[PDB]
Amino acid sequence: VNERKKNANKIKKLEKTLEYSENAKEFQLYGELLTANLYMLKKGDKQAEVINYESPTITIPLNPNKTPSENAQAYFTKYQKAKNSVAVVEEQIRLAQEEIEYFDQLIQQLSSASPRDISEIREELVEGKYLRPHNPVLETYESTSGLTILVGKNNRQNEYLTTRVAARDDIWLHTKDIPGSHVVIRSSEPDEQTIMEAATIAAYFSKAKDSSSVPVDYTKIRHVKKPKPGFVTYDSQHTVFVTPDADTVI
Amino acid sequence: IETKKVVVEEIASKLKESKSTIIVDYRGLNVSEVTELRKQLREANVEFKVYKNTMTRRAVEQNDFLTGPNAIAFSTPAKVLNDFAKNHEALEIKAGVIEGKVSTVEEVKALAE
Amino acid sequence: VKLQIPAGKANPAPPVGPALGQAGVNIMGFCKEFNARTADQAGLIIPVEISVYEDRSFTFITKTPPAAVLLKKAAGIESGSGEPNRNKVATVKRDKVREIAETKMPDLNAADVEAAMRMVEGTARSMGIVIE
Amino acid sequence: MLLPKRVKYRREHRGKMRGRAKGGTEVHFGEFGIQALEASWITNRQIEAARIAMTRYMKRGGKVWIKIFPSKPYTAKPLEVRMGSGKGAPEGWVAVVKPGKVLFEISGVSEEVAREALRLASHKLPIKTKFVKRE
Amino acid sequence: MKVRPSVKPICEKCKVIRRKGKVMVICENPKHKQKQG
RNA sequence: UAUACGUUAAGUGGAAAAGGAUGUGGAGUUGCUUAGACAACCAGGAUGUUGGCUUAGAAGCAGCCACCAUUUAAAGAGUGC
RNA sequence: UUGGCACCUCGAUGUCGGCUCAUCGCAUCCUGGGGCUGUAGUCGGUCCCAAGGGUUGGGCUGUUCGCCCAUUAAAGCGGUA
């Protein structure tokens, strides 16, 4: 939580810093206009009453020492520079937000965790080098239609189950929302009873346990996106409003 | 070496095969006007090529006009040539020949007529 | 003076305004004249030549579109290859090769259809297109 | 900055650079190489300077094959010190070179490019050199 | 001038010559103008 | 103030390097070359095309990739400004 | 310069700084003459030739050096036990 909170405040710093160097488009448009009007212009002038290609009339300042060519090129240069810095800040934003979402899913998992997956999560983070110092993957209980629904509170074990423990046409059931675990039955194609029973297991281990308005997303594993870690997108999906449940979900 | 030998050989070949040919300068004109001439003679089916004076002479004897810049136009023609000349007027139309009969400037003009 | 201008779009100022502001002629009346002649596929980047005598006697000539334009319309693509001969990403048909050939026969030097085709094939090599 | 991982003796005599080389007198890994015309000690900083120089000139070019390795260490006492009181501490690492010895090679690249790169490297090196190619 | 012992041509139009026993470089570009010393 | 043969011309001789250079002497290899070379002078030095990508713009020449075909005697999808 | 070695000097070669007195080199601070310039001008930068002459007075500190004030065309770097 310290790291996630830190990253959130980090991007807050970056965002409120970003609001003070955003003069790119002005310089772009100025360079455009100057290159368009590079024949009416003296070298030594301060200003330029110029029309935009809505036919306003803009007065662009100049360097009275420079040529219009030099001046317009300087505007293009500043556009280039602001463009570069904004690209940098946006990349840092993307990094920080990826990390924050990673840790948010991680905290969801840790909330809906078992020790067997916590032992894996520790090694996952030591691998991520936030920390320092083999087939058991999934955990299941009873389900509707006398079925078995497997899950993993660990991101790594969840991915292992989603990839190596089922096919493409099988169904994955998870949150239709921000953060929750990932779980499914082996070739999850059972009845609507099991479809609604999986929603209870989803809402139990979620970002908001005991939340009585949590929608679960059920989608074919064939559209499970294996794109940080556990940044899994989904398609071929439907969604159903559901709620948490008791240990009868077992 | 033998390459130049082959070259003069085929030049004499196409020479003796033709029975109308014209000998002109290519100087003081751009590649655009040149290729204009080339295209109108392509559709005229009148061949036109560019050779060196020395090897050209060797092919002929295998005369005075053969010096200086010299391109050649075979019709196995003079009309299109003189038309281009009246158009542009930076040329020499120095010589011609027909059936091996050396044609004068006025004579190639008359064939153009 | 050459200008690469879409047909129906005349007086999108910033490229073209300078193109004649040195000449000092009426930019916009000329532009709408250009549209009037080029009542064509808007976006078809026509090569238009312009020649102004010193007294402002301007006369302009529209011409066939570029090879890259015709080939990108053929393949329905936006861009040629960023690294042709390392990543070919486009393809069109020999029939279309014939078509663009027969189109721009009037302008080229090559009296031969097939030689004009070879020219377009070199263009296709340059822009990352294969032929089928 | 090359280094021998492990060594018996961190301190050696310096030695004597008499005569010509034993081996490595002709390019055989690559095509266009460089050889020496003198004898001298050469350092890891020198060789890496030359290496990065040619690779910057070439920018993707083929293969290099350095033909040496600075096995020898060299000592240097600290500053402003009298003589004696043991041998000085090691400082760096050195390769010893005889004349007739090939230092750098090149393959995958044309002759002019190779000659220019090796020129650039020679100017980073102390000694007199010659451009060479495979027979 | 650019006095220096490493005298070379820079561009193709730079032309080395010798003068009073000294080596010099000529070019229309005066920044390419050199001499040994 | 020898003889013969050559070398150097810097006072080298009579102080020293990396490196640089149409310095000269001696050989040796090799390309082109009176079917006419090198230099110079005259002329041309083009078309798809502004090659495409990137770029606000990159039009032979910021940069990435490619570098083909046509007129062709030849003109590079380009050597330098 | 800091130093290394111990070659003259321990039957004595007085050692920092300052004063007076100058003198030499030039890798020139100014003055003189030029090239290049990212030298418009004025001012400059850098490099080349030039050692003829000139190259300040004070506060603090024993000081050298250095900082500071105010000037100057400039307030040179060093050798001479």
Tab-separated table of C-alpha atoms in Angstrom, chain A residues 3 102-103 121-131 229:
chain	number	residue	atom	x	y	z
A	3	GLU	CA	4.200	1.716	-2.872
A	102	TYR	CA	-0.801	-3.810	-10.801
A	103	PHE	CA	-0.623	-3.149	-7.068
A	121	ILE	CA	3.103	-13.505	-4.534
A	122	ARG	CA	6.117	-12.871	-2.321
A	123	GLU	CA	8.389	-14.499	-4.875
A	124	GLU	CA	6.650	-12.566	-7.639
A	125	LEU	CA	7.510	-9.308	-5.909
A	126	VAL	CA	11.050	-10.395	-5.107
A	127	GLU	CA	11.307	-11.115	-8.831
A	128	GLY	CA	10.021	-7.598	-9.413
A	129	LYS	CA	12.872	-6.656	-7.048
A	130	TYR	CA	10.649	-4.779	-4.643
A	131	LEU	CA	11.735	-7.409	-2.103
A	229	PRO	CA	1.786	-8.863	-15.054
